[PDB]
Design an enzyme around this catalytic site. Structure first.
Site, PDB file in Angstrom:
ATOM      1  N   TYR A 111     -14.145 114.994  89.784  1.00 33.35           N
ATOM      2  CA  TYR A 111     -14.354 113.680  89.190  1.00 33.35           C
ATOM      3  C   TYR A 111     -13.177 113.320  88.288  1.00 33.35           C
ATOM      4  CZ  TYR A 111     -19.453 113.530  90.256  1.00 33.35           C
ATOM      5  OH  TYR A 111     -20.672 113.522  90.870  1.00 33.35           O
TER       6      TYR A 111
ATOM      7  N   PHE B 201     -10.175 111.798  90.040  1.00 34.55           N
ATOM      8  CA  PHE B 201     -10.294 110.545  90.771  1.00 34.55           C
ATOM      9  C   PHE B 201     -10.662 109.383  89.849  1.00 34.55           C
ATOM     10  CE2 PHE B 201     -11.024 113.417  94.574  1.00 34.55           C
ATOM     11  CZ  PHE B 201      -9.868 113.047  95.221  1.00 34.55           C
TER      12      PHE B 201
ATOM     13  N   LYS C 118      -7.893 101.427  91.799  1.00 30.82           N
ATOM     14  CA  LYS C 118      -9.247 101.421  92.331  1.00 30.82           C
ATOM     15  C   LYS C 118     -10.179 100.681  91.372  1.00 30.82           C
ATOM     16  CE  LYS C 118     -12.683 104.793  94.104  1.00 30.82           C
ATOM     17  NZ  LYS C 118     -13.302 106.060  93.710  1.00 30.82           N
ATOM     18  N   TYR C 119     -10.077 100.988  90.072  1.00 30.96           N
ATOM     19  CA  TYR C 119     -11.031 100.485  89.097  1.00 30.96           C
ATOM     20  C   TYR C 119     -10.609  99.105  88.592  1.00 30.96           C
ATOM     21  CZ  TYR C 119     -12.764 105.206  89.791  1.00 30.96           C
ATOM     22  OH  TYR C 119     -13.226 106.364  90.349  1.00 30.96           O
TER      23      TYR C 119
ATOM     24  N   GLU D 217     -27.422 108.398  89.287  1.00 38.07           N
ATOM     25  CA  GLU D 217     -26.605 109.527  89.707  1.00 38.07           C
ATOM     26  C   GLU D 217     -27.510 110.698  90.073  1.00 38.07           C
ATOM     27  OE1 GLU D 217     -23.137 110.129  90.480  1.00 38.07           O
ATOM     28  OE2 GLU D 217     -24.420 111.751  91.235  1.00 38.07           O
TER      29      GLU D 217
ATOM     30  N   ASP E  47     -31.677 110.183  93.179  1.00 33.53           N
ATOM     31  CA  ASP E  47     -31.120 109.656  94.409  1.00 33.53           C
ATOM     32  C   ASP E  47     -31.486 108.178  94.486  1.00 33.53           C
ATOM     33  OD1 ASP E  47     -30.775 109.027  97.347  1.00 33.53           O
ATOM     34  OD2 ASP E  47     -30.302 111.175  97.441  1.00 33.53           O
ATOM     35  N   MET E  48     -30.546 107.347  94.949  1.00 39.28           N
ATOM     36  CA  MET E  48     -30.757 105.910  94.997  1.00 39.28           C
ATOM     37  C   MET E  48     -31.749 105.548  96.102  1.00 39.28           C
ATOM     38  SD  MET E  48     -27.264 104.516  96.786  1.00 39.28           S
ATOM     39  CE  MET E  48     -26.223 105.594  95.793  1.00 39.28           C
TER      40      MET E  48
ATOM     41  N   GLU F 138     -19.456 103.362  95.164  1.00 40.68           N
ATOM     42  CA  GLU F 138     -18.155 103.998  95.291  1.00 40.68           C
ATOM     43  C   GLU F 138     -18.289 105.141  96.295  1.00 40.68           C
ATOM     44  OE1 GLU F 138     -17.255 105.394  91.387  1.00 40.68           O
ATOM     45  OE2 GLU F 138     -15.214 106.067  91.851  1.00 40.68           O
TER      46      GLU F 138
ATOM     47  N   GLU G 193     -18.940 109.388 104.291  1.00 40.64           N
ATOM     48  CA  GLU G 193     -19.760 109.958 103.230  1.00 40.64           C
ATOM     49  C   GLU G 193     -21.153 109.325 103.217  1.00 40.64           C
ATOM     50  OE1 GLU G 193     -17.530 110.059  99.509  1.00 40.64           O
ATOM     51  OE2 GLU G 193     -16.014 111.369 100.420  1.00 40.64           O
TER      52      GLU G 193
HETATM   53  C1  LIG Z   1      -4.012 112.716  91.397  1.00 36.75           C
HETATM   54  C2  LIG Z   1      -3.242 112.414  92.655  1.00 36.75           C
HETATM   55  O1  LIG Z   1      -2.308 111.639  92.619  1.00 36.75           O
HETATM   56  N1  LIG Z   1      -3.577 112.999  93.822  1.00 36.75           N
HETATM   57  C3  LIG Z   1      -3.021 112.911  95.186  1.00 36.75           C
HETATM   58  C4  LIG Z   1      -4.289 113.622  95.685  1.00 36.75           C
HETATM   59  N2  LIG Z   1      -5.279 112.749  96.329  1.00 36.75           N
HETATM   60  C5  LIG Z   1      -6.351 113.355  96.958  1.00 36.75           C
HETATM   61  C6  LIG Z   1      -7.227 112.655  97.802  1.00 36.75           C
HETATM   62  C7  LIG Z   1      -8.272 113.376  98.390  1.00 36.75           C
HETATM   63  C8  LIG Z   1      -9.260 112.712  99.273  1.00 36.75           C
HETATM   64  O2  LIG Z   1      -8.906 111.950 100.154  1.00 36.75           O
HETATM   65  N3  LIG Z   1     -10.561 112.982  99.035  1.00 36.75           N
HETATM   66  C9  LIG Z   1     -11.647 112.383  99.813  1.00 36.75           C
HETATM   67  C10 LIG Z   1     -11.948 110.988  99.255  1.00 36.75           C
HETATM   68  O3  LIG Z   1     -13.102 110.475  99.931  1.00 36.75           O
HETATM   69  C11 LIG Z   1     -12.138 110.993  97.716  1.00 36.75           C
HETATM   70  C12 LIG Z   1     -13.324 111.848  97.224  1.00 36.75           C
HETATM   71  C13 LIG Z   1     -13.759 111.484  95.813  1.00 36.75           C
HETATM   72  C14 LIG Z   1     -14.658 112.311  95.131  1.00 36.75           C
HETATM   73  C15 LIG Z   1     -15.081 111.995  93.844  1.00 36.75           C
HETATM   74  C16 LIG Z   1     -14.616 110.843  93.207  1.00 36.75           C
HETATM   75  O4  LIG Z   1     -15.042 110.569  91.935  1.00 36.75           O
HETATM   76  C17 LIG Z   1     -15.039 109.247  91.357  1.00 36.75           C
HETATM   77  C18 LIG Z   1     -15.744 109.395  90.031  1.00 36.75           C
HETATM   78  O5  LIG Z   1     -15.180 110.063  89.015  1.00 36.75           O
HETATM   79  C19 LIG Z   1     -16.041 110.057  87.993  1.00 36.75           C
HETATM   80  N4  LIG Z   1     -17.107 109.418  88.342  1.00 36.75           N
HETATM   81  C20 LIG Z   1     -16.967 109.002  89.596  1.00 36.75           C
HETATM   82  C21 LIG Z   1     -18.053 108.215  90.259  1.00 36.75           C
HETATM   83  C22 LIG Z   1     -13.718 110.024  93.886  1.00 36.75           C
HETATM   84  C23 LIG Z   1     -13.299 110.345  95.180  1.00 36.75           C
HETATM   85  C24 LIG Z   1     -12.321 109.412  95.845  1.00 36.75           C
HETATM   86  N5  LIG Z   1     -12.320 109.583  97.304  1.00 36.75           N
HETATM   87  N6  LIG Z   1      -8.411 114.678  98.118  1.00 36.75           N
HETATM   88  C25 LIG Z   1      -7.571 115.311  97.303  1.00 36.75           C
HETATM   89  N7  LIG Z   1      -7.709 116.676  97.050  1.00 36.75           N
HETATM   90  C26 LIG Z   1      -9.071 117.244  97.108  1.00 36.75           C
HETATM   91  C27 LIG Z   1      -9.808 117.029  95.780  1.00 36.75           C
HETATM   92  C28 LIG Z   1      -8.993 117.644  94.638  1.00 36.75           C
HETATM   93  C29 LIG Z   1      -9.726 117.426  93.308  1.00 36.75           C
HETATM   94  C30 LIG Z   1      -7.610 116.981  94.603  1.00 36.75           C
HETATM   95  C31 LIG Z   1      -6.903 117.218  95.941  1.00 36.75           C
HETATM   96  N8  LIG Z   1      -6.561 114.655  96.748  1.00 36.75           N
HETATM   97  C32 LIG Z   1      -4.622 113.963  94.225  1.00 36.75           C
HETATM   98  C1  LIG Z   2     -17.912 109.399  92.953  1.00 38.79           C
HETATM   99  S1  LIG Z   2     -18.172 109.750  94.679  1.00 38.79           S
HETATM  100  C2  LIG Z   2     -19.900 109.231  94.854  1.00 38.79           C
HETATM  101  C3  LIG Z   2     -20.809 109.527  93.678  1.00 38.79           C
HETATM  102  O1  LIG Z   2     -22.132 109.033  93.982  1.00 38.79           O
HETATM  103  C4  LIG Z   2     -23.082 110.066  93.887  1.00 38.79           C
HETATM  104  N1  LIG Z   2     -24.051 109.866  94.956  1.00 38.79           N
HETATM  105  C5  LIG Z   2     -23.828 110.024  96.300  1.00 38.79           C
HETATM  106  N2  LIG Z   2     -24.880 109.770  97.037  1.00 38.79           N
HETATM  107  C6  LIG Z   2     -25.857 109.411  96.124  1.00 38.79           C
HETATM  108  C7  LIG Z   2     -27.200 109.027  96.285  1.00 38.79           C
HETATM  109  N3  LIG Z   2     -27.801 108.922  97.466  1.00 38.79           N
HETATM  110  N4  LIG Z   2     -27.899 108.724  95.166  1.00 38.79           N
HETATM  111  C8  LIG Z   2     -27.282 108.820  93.981  1.00 38.79           C
HETATM  112  N5  LIG Z   2     -26.028 109.175  93.710  1.00 38.79           N
HETATM  113  C9  LIG Z   2     -25.357 109.458  94.837  1.00 38.79           C
HETATM  114  C10 LIG Z   2     -22.309 111.376  93.992  1.00 38.79           C
HETATM  115  O2  LIG Z   2     -22.990 112.425  93.333  1.00 38.79           O
HETATM  116  C11 LIG Z   2     -20.978 111.007  93.329  1.00 38.79           C
HETATM  117  O3  LIG Z   2     -21.011 111.180  91.917  1.00 38.79           O
END
Ligand SMILES: CC(=O)N1CC(Nc2cc(C(=O)NC[C@@H](O)[C@@H]3Cc4ccc(OCc5ocnc5C)cc4CN3)nc(N3CCC(C)CC3)n2)C1
Ligand SMILES: CSC[C@H]1O[C@@H](n2cnc3c(N)ncnc32)[C@H](O)[C@@H]1O
Ligand SMILES: CC(=O)N1CC(Nc2cc(C(=O)NC[C@@H](O)[C@@H]3Cc4ccc(OCc5ocnc5C)cc4CN3)nc(N3CCC(C)CC3)n2)C1
Ligand SMILES: CSC[C@H]1O[C@@H](n2cnc3c(N)ncnc32)[C@H](O)[C@@H]1O
Lengths: 298, 624, 624, 302
Positions: C311, C314, C320-321, C379, C406-407, C422, C431
């Site tokens: 987390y 990302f 993105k945001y 969440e 779960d939603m 997201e 996903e």
């Molecule tokens: C910093 C930088 O410049 N770079 C270039 C690299 N970009 C990428 C890209 C992808 C990739 O394509 N992953 C699939 C994708 O679907 C991904 C999944 C996802 C999950 C969680 C989320 O959290 C968001 C949020 O945070 C807090 N709360 C909420 C809701 C975001 C993402 C984004 N999509 N994997 C990686 N890996 C695997 C994971 C390792 C930690 C880092 C290396 N690296 C790192």
């Molecule tokens: C940030 S990547 C998606 C986020 O949504 C959450 N999430 C995914 N599927 C569900 C779901 N069905 N209900 C609630 N939260 C979810 C995951 O735990 C993650 O934090």
């Protein structure tokens, strides 16, 4: 003031003591509080005195009228006193002699001495005036759950542990501990009228009544659906038994273990209970739901 | 030197605390991830709906810190094997919760206690977590001496025993053993061994030899005070620390400060102090520092050619070639009367000359002996031959005759007075020294010397759940799933326990005058064991007579000082075998062959039977 | 920056030479291990008995140097595919010899040329050596343009052609292709691509996209001279160098110094010069520098819980945001008339709130929009929920309602004006964003907005023998030997060639009013290919409409600048497929499901058929 | 009903003999493939150069017969675990030889005895043969009661014990257990359980429950004579036979005819007799006749 209300102890005049801890969130610590108004509790800015403790409060007790004895998570036993016309609350000593959390304390008949029980499996005897430990006893084989002073004797007390032992103590014997015969014992209360008599509650929510001479269970009752946290006898010459539990309920019991009252008011664990000196049918519980609750007892 | 950690069970603020212990000098901190007293409910309303947050936030530390500095600890109220169904069910859910949070934070290790015999349901939960989602480690907190067996004798109607129970005193090992067995020997599960004020019998301590001890826990209480006022340890506690420093465990300090006039770094200083005060490492030590318990599959020298850097390493053994020089020196004097000094030139042949260390040692011998010699250097590795011929032309001259050949094939111009070879493996005959020299002995004078003259292999039963687990981890695609257990490995045995004195296994002598030569062997050995233990394999060593009283050995009792050219060998077994104090281990060893390959088979027959290992050389042979 | 090496074919003394090139500034040296002219005989007497030494000694350099500095080179007289049986047999033995010597020395790489079409017997020998005894590498020297096709047109009775043959101009790729195919795509076999004065058509160069180029060979002759007198390259040669600097190849300089007034470091200086003169790396670049062609198996967000550090990474995506903030901002203004500013509080619900980036972006939106909102943060990951509640109490206050659920399960108190999610993977729906929001849409107002509103996945055929080989290397015990090819990977595609423009695959929109909702899909795509190539899989990208014209994309053509939160996906195929210029690639894609899991299947139907990949989700599913 | 076989250790002519036993009513014959007394030398000259032939020819029977009718038997002089190295080495070579000949002939089973505790080197040789070249079976001849524990108490200075050892009385099971453990539980290795005149305690017999008993060996000596003059068995021996008929073992008759007025089919007739006299199969029986010990993986009805 933190959310998890651990202790509640009236004194002679009727002022209510509160110990409390933060068991969650950034800071894990606690606080002592005096409420000259019982009904102002647990409101912070409507209190007579209050202090911040470095760590949380697992147990406390009155030391007479002004003294406050604290079982800390730190592994310290602490003595705080009421000062400045009972507006301040001031550390007198803080002694890290336990090697793990101090789970229980209890003041002895005299009131110059007390005994602590800890997760470090030891039991210690204190001189409060000296601020020194007198005896250290590794009698148990597991966490010490509860230590309960003999009402009228300063060489005698009970203890119970997760080792499933209940030890009757007598510091006059060279082997001071005596085992006395079950689910793990969680709580202890001497009978106020009759020495040689006490009660214990187990983790299975059963309250039991025991005669020391007999070492035979006089009576048992399934009172709670979960662990028994505390047992308190009422001030009456013929006393009631208040029983606490993790089932979030209070029960009150007669000389027979049958039920008279029952409260579901708490929505979280019921932690302590204390009968009003000024009214012997008023009963005050505290819980992790942060309620202070005043019960009226038939 | 000493990697160390502070154990706490009270943390008011993580950052304040973590600084304090960093300040104090600790490398890491063991702490709860939920408040130790904060019992949670999972089934029963209303308590289950307790508003969150349920604990502290991950944002309070950098990912860096979580990953490197923070060891988690299971909350003490969690009892998965409670006799009360309610508590059992609740603790199950709580344990999973705390474990997953640890995983979420990315903690490098997490602590769970073994406080009793039965931890079955605890194991089941852990196992399931292991098989769900890392390289995170689990440290099982195990007392060297169960609390019940170190209590004060102050219950007047329940006296502490005063008769020794041998096995009873080892019950905590059994707690661990059962647990790790239930968990299928996961490599993610290790021991944090907790040390008390009174130490048990050495047998009880030796019981932990070969076990995966990652940490040793030291309560403050167990520290004596010296005259100055500092904290120290008894000599017996010190012996244990030095043993633990060989295993390079992380030391964990727990409990409050009882030396309040002194600091909490004073405890840690005592360890740091002992750590340099460790007795200096011997000559064989400082070799294999990084090879400790590292498993290497022995490779055929006959079928494959050694690389340049491999020879380079082993040429530089001071003792091996000193001993070789001396043996050749003494043999010369025994062969050539002083009167015949200049009349008699002895014909030496180095058989397997490599890059020529025995050649040079042969020259250094004859110089010192004041005798005359003619050298052949026979080497089958043509890559090495290139080294010999650059040597020969540049330096040695025609005194040396480089022969690029197998010694079993070569047709010699003349016979040798002395054949000199270096064909011994860690178990002497494992590199097929017998077969090579047999094929070469036809060109030894009817009265010639072979150096070495004889070699004998030795075996000893060992216990090491660690090495057992490393072997187990050697499964490979496209072969028998248990092949790894039916082959020997070279290894600097380190974390292990030898269960009985080594005994001779196989012996060869050269030349072998026997008209009907047979290099096959069968040998039954009987190993009296005086401890309770678990058998996991047999260590192999060897000794050789180079000449007369000039010897080399890696047998620990008689080990040649400094000599690093051979590590021990390890012969594993598929299934570990319990051995009770008193019992004899009976092992069987075959050396087998056909015209193409040579191999070992082996079996345990007492106190129970194993399978015969490596039947028909199915898992392992050595190419002729 | 530029790792580089000197190629020599004359070394009088190794040390003298190696110093010289070290001095000159080279990192390593390519040189013969036997003298290039020193032809040896293996069968025929008397020449076979030529007294040694057969070459130089290993003792002339440290093992350190051999391992790091010296690239070996096959002697040029060795011809394993000679038409003369004698020479064929002799060269076989010679090649083995030189290779084994390289191995003996422990050289990190060894050079063999591809000089003609037929290298069959050469491959057979190499293959056998590979399967005998390391991580040593073989560099096949391949001309970008065969010598025959760059000769001077000065044979009067044999003119050089002047008609284009498209495939003819690509013959050297075919030399390599056949060779590596014969050798079963050994990962120990790579290309040293040799560059000449005249470059071929771009198609001939693009032919080498996706191929394992470890080195690029630059003759001195190909360097123009500038006015100063320094050596330089044409702009066309420069374009190629910059392409090669992306692939981080080692540059090899060969040939004598033609700029004799200048030094030999002057050539190398030109490279060093170009290397910093490389056009600055973009925002997406400098991200995935170390993730290039790194394969990651996508993991279920629904079935597993994300770790804290995942987390953390990302959350810090600026774009993105920003885009999420804007979409919510614009939606607020469209929903609440200015007159109703204070009358109307919009109900927002973040569905999959994690550690709350969309929560915060929702707050930042409403502040800027000057509108009022009530937030729920839903969440399912309870570990993350701990972060939310520490946030909520500390900062957000009761404006936010953290729901730990779960939603698809949650029963909401009131309906939402806006659901914000997201849940998109690299291929949008991978996903299972569709299934989640479907189960959640019942608590959207009958006129509510989902952000995002729609997403579409895109596919494109690619060639990469590199990525193909990495996938192949993903075989694992205890599963189908080809499972690795029937599952998608997330990967920063780097060394590859896109064979046709991406095309939309699957699309979803939310809310989905359809009475009979079905998230299954079947899609036939037709990809016109205008090159000769080899198909190895399909890249996946996606675009999404957050709101109106606020979009995110990883589709390269329309990629959101800077955004690193998604790498591309790769769908491999078991067997590569030749595609000739002109042909259409036809691919089939299914999205499949049952009540428990979701998965993709896929097949190529033109110009030949593949198997259907991942049938019944046997190799790969996503847990509901 | 009763599949049965004749054990012989003297066969003057295979065809004469095989007819005789076929005539008698046996389904197969256990016999030596080399002459039991014909000790051979493998190392030591001159004896090793003994002119062949080393035994009888394969041409003396049809392949059909070899495959179905002839159970081979290890020659009794072959002692792979001899304390004498010489004998050990020689027996190794001899055992391999006899085994390979059995394989060459395509015999459906071959007999090797367990006569002592230590059969380690014997197992090693067998194991190697198993992993070299079939679905041929090895029948380990194991006494229910070791010979030493059923000898006559007629050595005056070596009395037979008269205290029960519970585990001691089970030593032959341990012989088998160790052997099959050493051999890694090869499915090609089964038991031919040999039955003596005096039966041990039921525990000693129940010890063989769950073990792969392919054959039961019955000496002629263990047969009582009835009033008519026929051979019969004690009721206790009968109980065992009925237990063995559940396991559908092949019965092997060994030893000379002691009921010489009666025929040798009279022994076999007693078995045939008991076999129908088996107590009728219950209702659950006659179900799962062919499902006995057949493993089925349970499948989800949902
Ligand atoms: C910093 C930088 O410049 N770079 C270039 C690299 N970009 C990428 C890209 C992808 C990739 O394509 N992953 C699939 C994708 O679907 C991904 C999944 C996802 C999950 C969680 C989320 O959290 C968001 C949020 O945070 C807090 N709360 C909420 C809701 C975001 C993402 C984004 N999509 N994997 C990686 N890996 C695997 C994971 C390792 C930690 C880092 C290396 N690296 C790192
Ligand atoms: C940030 S990547 C998606 C986020 O949504 C959450 N999430 C995914 N599927 C569900 C779901 N069905 N209900 C609630 N939260 C979810 C995951 O735990 C993650 O934090
Ligand atoms: C320097 C130091 O202090 N230490 C402690 C470590 N000791 C050891 C021991 C063993 C081991 O037991 N190996 C089997 C053993 O049989 C070995 C085989 C052999 C082969 C070649 C030879 O060449 C001699 C010669 O050189 C030039 N010419 C001629 C003839 C010597 C040996 C010695 N025995 N393996 C290793 N490994 C594997 C090999 C790696 C190169 C080094 C690490 N390390 C290194
Ligand atoms: C130094 S370890 C043994 C050395 O002897 C060589 N060697 C081993 N077996 C033979 C053999 N049969 N003939 C000649 N050299 C041999 C090996 O190549 C190695 O250099």
């Amino acid at each position: 003031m933190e959310r998890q209300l651990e202790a509640a102890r009236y004194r002679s005049d009727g002022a209510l003591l509160l110990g409390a801890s933060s068991l969650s969130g950034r800071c894990w610590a606690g606080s002592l509080w005096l409420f000259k108004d019982p009904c102002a509790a647990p409101n912070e800015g409507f209190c007579s005195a209050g202090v911040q403790t470095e760590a949380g409060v697992a147990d406390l007790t009155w030391v007479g009228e002004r003294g406050i004895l604290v079982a800390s998570d730190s592994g310290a036993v602490e003595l705080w006193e009421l000062d400045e016309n009972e507006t301040l609350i001031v550390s007198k000593f803080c002694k890290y002699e336990h090697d793990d959390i101090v789970s229980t304390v209890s003041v002895l008949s005299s009131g110059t001495q007390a005994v602590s029980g800890s997760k470090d499996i030891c039991i210690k005897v204190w001189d409060l005036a000296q601020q020194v430990v007198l005896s250290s006893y590794r009698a148990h084989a597991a966490q010490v759950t509860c230590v309960a002073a003999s009402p009228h004797k300063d060489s005698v007390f009970l203890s119970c542990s997760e080792d499933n032992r209940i030890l009757l103590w007598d510091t006059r014997c060279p082997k001071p501990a005596s085992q006395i015969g079950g689910y793990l014992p969680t709580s202890l209360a001497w009978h106020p009228q009759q020495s040689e008599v006490f009660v214990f509650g187990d983790e299975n929510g059963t309250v039991s009544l025991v005669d020391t001479k007999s070492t035979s269970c006089v009576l048992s009752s399934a009172v709670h659906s979960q662990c028994v946290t505390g047992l308190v006898f009422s001030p009456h010459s013929v006393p009631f038994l208040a029983s606490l539990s993790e089932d979030c309920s209070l029960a009150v019991l007669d000389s027979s273990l049958s039920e008279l009252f029952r409260s579901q008011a708490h929505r979280d664990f019921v932690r302590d209970a204390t009968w009003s000196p000024l009214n012997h049918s008023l009963l005050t519980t505290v819980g992790w739901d942060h309620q202070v609750v005043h019960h009226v007892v038939p | 030197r000493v990697s160390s950690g502070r154990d706490l069970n009270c943390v008011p603020e993580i950052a304040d605390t973590l600084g304090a212990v960093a300040k104090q000098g600790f490398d890491f901190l063991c702490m709860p991830v939920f408040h130790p007293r904060f019992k949670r409910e999972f089934i029963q309303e209303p308590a289950k709906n307790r508003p969150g947050p349920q604990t502290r936030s991950d944002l309070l530390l950098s990912g860096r810190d979580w990953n490197t500095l923070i060891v988690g600890k299971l909350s003490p109220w969690i009892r998965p094997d409670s006799k009360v169904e309610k508590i059992r069910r609740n603790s199950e859910a709580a344990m999973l919760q705390e474990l997953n949070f640890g995983a979420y934070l990315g903690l490098p290790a997490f602590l769970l206690p073994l406080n009793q015999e039965d931890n079955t349901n605890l194991a089941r939960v852990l196992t399931n977590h292991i098989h769900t989602g890392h390289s995170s480690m689990f440290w099982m907190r195990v007392p060297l001496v169960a609390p019940e067996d170190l209590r004060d004798d102050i219950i007047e109607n329940a006296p502490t025993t005063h008769t020794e129970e041998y096995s009873g005193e080892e019950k905590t090992w059994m707690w661990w053993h059962n647990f790790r067995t239930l968990c299928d020997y996961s490599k993610r599960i290790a021991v944090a061994l907790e040390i008390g004020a009174d130490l048990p019998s050495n047998h009880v301590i030796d019981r932990w030899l070969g076990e995966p001890i990652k940490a040793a826990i030291l309560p403050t209480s167990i520290f004596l005070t010296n005259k100055k006022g500092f904290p120290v340890l008894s000599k017996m506690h010190q012996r244990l620390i030095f043993r633990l420093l060989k295993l390079e465990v992380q030391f964990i300090i727990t409990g409050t400060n009882h030396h309040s006039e002194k600091e909490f770094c004073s405890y840690l200083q005592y360890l740091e102090y002992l750590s340099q005060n460790r007795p200096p490492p011997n000559a064989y030590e400082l070799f294999a520092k990084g090879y400790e318990d590292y498993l290497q599959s022995p490779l055929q020298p006959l079928m494959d050619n050694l690389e340049s850097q491999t020879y380079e390493v082993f040429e530089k053994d001071p003792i091996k070639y000193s001993q070789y020089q001396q043996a050749i020196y003494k043999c010369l004097l025994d062969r050539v009367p002083e009167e015949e000094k200049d009349t008699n030139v002895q014909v030496l042949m180095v058989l397997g000359a490599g890059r020529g260390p025995l050649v040079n040692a042969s020259l250094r011998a004859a110089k010192q002996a004041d005798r005359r010699i003619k050298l052949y250097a026979v080497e089958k590795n043509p890559n090495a031959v290139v080294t010999l011929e650059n040597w020969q032309f540049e330096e040695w001259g025609s005194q040396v005759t480089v022969v690029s050949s197998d010694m079993r094939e070569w047709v010699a111009p003349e016979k040798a007075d002395i054949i000199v070879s270096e064909l011994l493996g860690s178990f002497a005959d494992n590199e097929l020294s017998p077969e090579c020299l047999d094929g070469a002995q036809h060109f030894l004078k009817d009265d010639g010397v072979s150096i070495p003259g004889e070699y004998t292999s030795f075996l000893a039963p060992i216990s090491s759940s660690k090495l057992y687990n490393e072997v187990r981890a050697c499964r490979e695609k496209d072969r028998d799933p248990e092949a790894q257990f039916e082959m020997p490995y070279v290894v600097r045995l380190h974390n292990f326990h030898q269960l009985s004195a080594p005994q001779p296994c196989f012996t060869f002598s050269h030349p072998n005058r026997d008209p009907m030569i047979d290099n096959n062997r069968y040998c039954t050995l009987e190993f009296p064991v005086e401890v309770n233990t678990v058998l996991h394999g047999f260590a192999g060593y060897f000794e050789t007579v180079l000449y007369q009283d000039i010897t080399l050995s890696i047998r620990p009792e008689t080990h040649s000082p400094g000599m690093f050219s051979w590590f021990p060998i390890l012969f594993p077994i598929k299934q570990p075998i319990t051995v009770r104090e008193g019992q004899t281990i009976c092992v069987r060893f075959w050396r087998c062959s056909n015209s193409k390959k040579v191999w070992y088979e082996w079996a345990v027959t007492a106190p129970v039977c194993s399978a015969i290992h490596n039947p028909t050389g199915r898992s392992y042979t050595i190419g002729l």
